[PDB]
Amino acid sequence: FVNQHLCGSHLVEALYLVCGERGFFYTDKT
Partner 1 sequence: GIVEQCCTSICSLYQLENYCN
The contact set with partner 1 (CB under 8 A) reads 1-8, 11, 14-15, 17-20, 22-30
What kind and span of H or E run contains 11?
helix 9-19
Q: In the complex, what is the shortest distance from the CB of residue 23 to ligand CRS, in angstroms, rounded to a whole number? A: 3
Least distance CB 13 / a second copy (angstroms): 6
What is the DSSP-derived secondary structure letter of residue 20?
T
Give the residue with the Cβ less far from ligand CRS, 23 or 30.
23
Neighbours of 5 (CB within 10 A): 7
Which residues contribute to the site for a second copy (CB under 8 A)?
1-4, 6-10, 12-29
